[PDB]
Design a protein around this ligand. Structure first.
Ligand SMILES: Nc1ncnc2c1ncn2[C@@H]1O[C@H](COP(=O)(O)OP(=O)(O)OP(O)(O)=S)[C@@H](O)[C@H]1O
Ligand SMILES: Nc1ncnc2c1ncn2[C@@H]1O[C@H](COP(=O)(O)OP(=O)(O)OP(O)(O)=S)[C@@H](O)[C@H]1O
Lengths: 558, 53, 149, 249
DNA sequence: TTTTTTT
């Protein structure tokens, strides 16, 4: 009697506010029109509703308190009232012991996604002689949210001797999945390994988190299992009842700001919030974040479009301090420092008896940024795999389990020291690094940074760092992903005449100073005008972008 | 120890015979002739010592 | 339809989706095949062959066109294409030894020649392998599946 | 004294934050007992890691543990215990280049990355390293050119803060004083008078520890604007000093 | 199927 009173009361409240009613109206009308277009020319949305915690507070604090205190009594009847209405219409650190048996909002990182298996709920069985169907359900502790008597064996020959032929199609199924979320590592105490728990999803939310993202989670803390009173520490935990959580004036501001001619320089100086000089270096980070164009050839292979730069310089020129700026400003990047053994270029498959995979560092940074620190200090083992990652954009893993082949087209930035000391221009331009020769042609830009001692520069470094101890960034990444979907460019005739003369300069006179001169350099000549056109959001390719690229080659090398 | 090597193995001759054999296979007629082997010698004298320019 | 599906192909498979009965309520699925439509029709299974071969012969300047036709996506390297055509030919064979109709030409030089032709060889002719991607058991022993191999 | 307190900590709009704790080097001639000094440094700070060399019986340094339930898990190390503390490294030249890179980064950007078979995180390390080296051939390293000490390069020292050279000059009064001062340390507890000194100065070591705990989180130090122009004019003089010793030589 | 060694 209690259940129907809670049902009718919440139904009255849901009937009290019609704001959600027109939402369900749009749900039903849209699914109707979607099935209407699918059944007229040729000859999706679920039923769960976001309920704000707005009106529940202005109606009954008793009922409010009941939801956030004992949710195992009010969410099922409220959904029951909703389904009736649908039919009438047609921190982990302080999480244990207390902050328990309630609805908990959890934040953290998506990691180690498990496997997808479906689960049966409603059985359909046909009897031969009676010529009738039947009905039988089964429940487990994930689905009921209430401690009910479990009813597990698949039925046959129930009452008279009629063959209970089971049927399908009409028999229902629901998928199932469990994932782990550890809290954010910067939030941790003085110095420790972060500790974690897990949350189980349901049917329409299977495979929404891949290992490696930033996710807010809202759900209910559910504890199952016989805690050692079965036959020594039990009562293992998990979380259920879940949701997934990762302007026109603003976009008009974007279109309005982009109507200028020197914002590349303005954004260039913008990306130096604490570093003096290195103007064209910031210009190159803008062009890397632009990402270039992708032109897959006719029945051939794709051509890589992003740009990768490794640095070398005197050990005091923000070599490592330029990296975290690129870390925070871009999107979906992972920083690798020092060693990278067993998991940068591979997945290793160490995981019922089966073989599973965990996406490695190079794979997880797909369509993103790879931050590599101390490239010469990397052991010689993975150096072979770096050529494959950087040139064919694929990773083939052939271990004893299953040989596979996949895609990762990541952007990579590295930072290395000279071989010994500061002799970066003293000995010879060649092999001040003692890197393999193919890696020279593999990387796009190679910066040589000196530590030239002067005085105007000395005073300017002084007041910059000194006032440091005593237009903006969020506008920029929005400007980036907006510039991604409609500013894709196309090459023009004017793009040819400059880079041809430029490649002639690369072979007739550039070889007299340094090396190498590859056709890949000419590909970068196309990519820079492309990225300049993406930053200016142009559609064509202009001669002026190539004029900029000539200075970019001179500043990067000569 | 100049650009040219010291000795010529008989496998060089075995290879050039099989090469001219494949050259005859591209004629699809079993018409092993003077130019058939001459092309086999051309890719040997041109394959090696192409470092003149 | 058994013994009719080679591994590593492109095929249209039709069927019905049924689970299999076995932590207590875990349903492992499978598919029962109903129809096979294979993309990339297998060769060797003469009329349509000579329909283009006789026209290819009577086309004039066939020898330069054949080697010019294998991987024309680069510039120059005409004799290189000649060597690639001759590698594609091969095909040669009492109380002694037979003859191996295989060619083994090595390539030295750098750098813009470098994988552009190397992957193209297996394109025209092919499993592409690297140094570390294959172990000592890779290029040459596992637990036997469902069907000590 | 300056190492046990720790400087400022900047949380700028800049994508990085800077570093606060400092570093101590003691390269020099043997017999100095700089060893006893580094042991007592470990005893004073509340959390700190003292290491004597590159080769242990049992003391490790990003831990990789693969095993029950066939699960990979992260155990620990040494910089992890000393996040926000003191690291003491003895035998700076007797050390290998096997995980030295983690130390070549832990003191400068506070960011340890792991991209192995188990995990793929970027963690924190707020440490401070204290060195105690020995040049080759002892006191003769200063008789040849004044460099000739680290065989790899000088960039590690550029990534340190303070470099001290301990010399050994005979002064008979200083020698007699260091003699009888140490005999008084061993026997007859003459230097050990300390209790009246406790009555007059520095009543305890544990007192100093409780004081540092109180000192670190309470004050929010920052420099003063009238003092900044002094340092700006001084960095010029040091860089000029290096110009004088470098360009003409 | 991956971590500490040494010729
Ligand atoms: N132009 C600059 N403007 C501001 N800060 C700077 C500048 N150049 C250097 N820095 C300083 O860069 C320091 C950190 O330098 P790093 O690049 O980490 O030294 P490092 O030894 O090269 O680092 P690694 O990773 O060990 S190579 C910080 O204290 C910054 O203040
Ligand atoms: N005032 C003192 N000066 C020097 N040594 C002293 C003094 N008082 C006691 N000692 C002892 O004398 C030893 C001298 O060696 P150290 O001073 O440790 O030399 P060292 O330079 O540390 O050599 P290391 O440890 O390999 S760098 C110390 O380890 C103490 O046992």
């Amino acid at each position: 009697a209690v259940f129907g009173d809670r049902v009718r009361r919440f139904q009255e409240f849901l009937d009290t506010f019609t704001s959600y009613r027109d939402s369900v109206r749009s749900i039903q009308v849209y699914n109707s029109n979607n099935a209407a277009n699918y059944n007229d020319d040729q000859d999706i949305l679920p039923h769960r509703i976001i309920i704000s915690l707005d009106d529940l507070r202005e109606f009954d604090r008793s009922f409010w308190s009941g939801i956030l205190v004992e949710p195992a009594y009010f969410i099922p009847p409220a959904e029951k009232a909703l389904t009736d209405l649908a039919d009438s219409m047609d921190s982990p650190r302080t999480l244990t012991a207390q902050h328990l048996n309630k609805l908990v909002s959890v934040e953290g990182i998506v990691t180690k996604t498990s496997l997808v298996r479906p689960k049966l709920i409603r059985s359909v069985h046909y009897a031969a002689k009676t010529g009738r169907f039947h009905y039988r359900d089964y429940t487990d502790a994930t689905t009921t949210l209430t401690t009910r008597i479990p009813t597990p064996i698949y039925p046959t020959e129930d009452t008279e001797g009629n063959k209970l032929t089971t049927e399908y199609g009409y028999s229902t199924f629901i998928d199932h999945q469990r994932i782990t979320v550890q809290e954010m590592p910067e939030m941790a105490p003085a110095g420790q390994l972060p500790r974690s728990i897990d949350v189980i999803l349901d049917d329409d939310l299977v495979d929404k988190t891949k290992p490696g993202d930033r996710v807010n989670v809202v759900g209910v803390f559910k504890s199952l299992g016989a805690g050692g009173m079965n036959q020594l520490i039990g009562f293992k935990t998990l979380i259920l009842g879940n949701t997934v959580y990762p302007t026109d004036f603003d976009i008009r501001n974007i279109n309005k700001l982009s109507k200028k001619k020197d914002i590349f320089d303005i954004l260039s100086q913008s990306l130096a919030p604490s570093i003096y000089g290195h103007d064209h270096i910031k210009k190159a980070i803008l062009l890397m974040l632009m990402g270039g164009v992708e032109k897959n050839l006719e029945n051939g292979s794709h051509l890589r479009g992003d740009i990768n730069i490794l640095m070398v310089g005197d050990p005091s020129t923000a070599k490592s301090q330029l990296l975290r700026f690129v870390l925070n400003t871009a999107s979906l990047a992972i920083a690798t420092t020092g060693r990278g053994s067993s998991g940068v270029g591979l997945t290793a498959a160490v995981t019922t008896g089966e073989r599973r995979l965990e996406a490695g560092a190079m794979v997880l940074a797909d369509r993103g940024v790879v931050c590599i620190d101390e490239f010469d200090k990397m052991t010689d083992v993975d150096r072979v795999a770096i050529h494959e990652v950087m040139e064919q954009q694929t990773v083939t893993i052939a271990k004893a389990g299953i040989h596979t082949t996949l895609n990762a087209r990541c952007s990579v930035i590295a930072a290395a020291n000279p071989v010994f000391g500061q002799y970066d221009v003293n000995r010879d331009p060649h092999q001040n690094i003692a890197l393999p020769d193919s890696l020279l042609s593999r990387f796009d830009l190679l910066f040589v940074v000196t530590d030239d001692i002067n005085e105007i520069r000395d005073r300017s470094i002084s007041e910059h760092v000194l006032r440091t101890h005593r237009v903006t960034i969020p506008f920029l990444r929005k400007y980036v992903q907006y510039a991604k979907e409609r500013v894709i460019p196309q090459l023009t005739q004017e793009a040819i005449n400059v880079i041809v003369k430029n490649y002639t300069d690369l072979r007739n006179d550039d070889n007299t100073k340094k090396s190498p001169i590859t056709a890949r350099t000419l590909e970068t000549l196309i990519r820079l005008a492309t990225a300049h056109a993406k930053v200016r959001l142009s559609k064509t390719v202009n001669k002026v972008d190539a004029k900029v690229a000539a200075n970019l080659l001179r500043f990067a090398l000569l | 120890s100049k650009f040219s090597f010291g000795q010529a193995t008989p496998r060089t001759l075995l290879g050039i015979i099989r090469l001219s054999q494949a050259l005859a296979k591209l004629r699809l007629a079993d018409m092993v002739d003077i130019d058939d082997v001459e092309e086999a010698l051309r890719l040997v004298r041109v394959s090696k010592e192409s470092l003149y320019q | 339809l058994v013994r009719s599906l080679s591994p590593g192909d492109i095929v249209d498979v039709t069927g019905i989706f049924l689970p299999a009965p076995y932590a207590g309520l875990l349903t492992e699925t499978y598919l029962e095949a109903q129809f096979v439509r294979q993309h990339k029709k297998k060769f060797a299974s003469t009329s349509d062959v000579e329909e283009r071969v006789m026209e290819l012969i009577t086309s004039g300047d066939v020898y330069n066109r054949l080697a010019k036709s294998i991987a024309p996506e680069i510039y120059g390297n005409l004799d290189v294409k000649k060597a690639l055509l001759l590698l594609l030919v091969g095909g040669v064979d009492g109380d002694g030894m037979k003859i191996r109709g295989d060619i083994n030409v090595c390539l030295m030089g750098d750098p813009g020649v470098k994988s552009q032709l190397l992957k193209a060889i297996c394109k025209i002719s092919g499993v592409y392998t690297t140094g570390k991607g294959s172990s000592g058991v890779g290029l040459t022993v596992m637990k036997d599946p469902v069907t000590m191999i | 004294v300056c190492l046990l307190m720790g400087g400022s900590k900047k949380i700028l709009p800049d994508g990085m934050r800077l570093r606060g704790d400092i570093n101590v080097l003691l390269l020099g001639d043997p017999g100095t007992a700089k060893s006893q000094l580094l042991k007592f440094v470990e005893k004073v700070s509340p959390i700190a890691v003292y290491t004597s060399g590159k080769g242990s019986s049992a003391a490790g340094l990003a831990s990789v543990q693969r095993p029950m339930t066939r699960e990979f898990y992260l155990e620990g190390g040494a910089m992890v215990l000393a996040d926000g503390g003191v690291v003491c490294i003895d035998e700076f030249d007797k050390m290998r280049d096997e995980d030295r890179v983690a130390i070549h980064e832990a003191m400068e950007q506070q960011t340890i990355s792991i991209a192995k078979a188990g995990i793929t995180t970027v963690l924190n390390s707020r440490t401070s390293v204290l060195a105690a080296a020995n040049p080759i051939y002892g006191r003769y390293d200063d008789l040849k050119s004044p460099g000739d000490n680290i065989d790899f390069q000088t960039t590690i020292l550029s990534r340190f803060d303070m470099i001290f050279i301990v010399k050994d000059d005979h002064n008979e009064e200083r020698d007699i004083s260091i003699a009888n001062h140490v005999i008084n340390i061993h026997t007859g507890n003459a230097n050990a008078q300390n209790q009246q000194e406790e009555n007059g100065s520095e009543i305890s070591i544990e007192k100093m520890k409780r004081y540092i705990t109180y000192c670190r989180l309470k004050c929010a130090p920052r420099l003063s604007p009238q003092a900044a122009e002094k340092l700006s004019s001084n960095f010029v003089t040091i860089r000029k000093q290096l110009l004088i010793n470098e360009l003409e030589s």
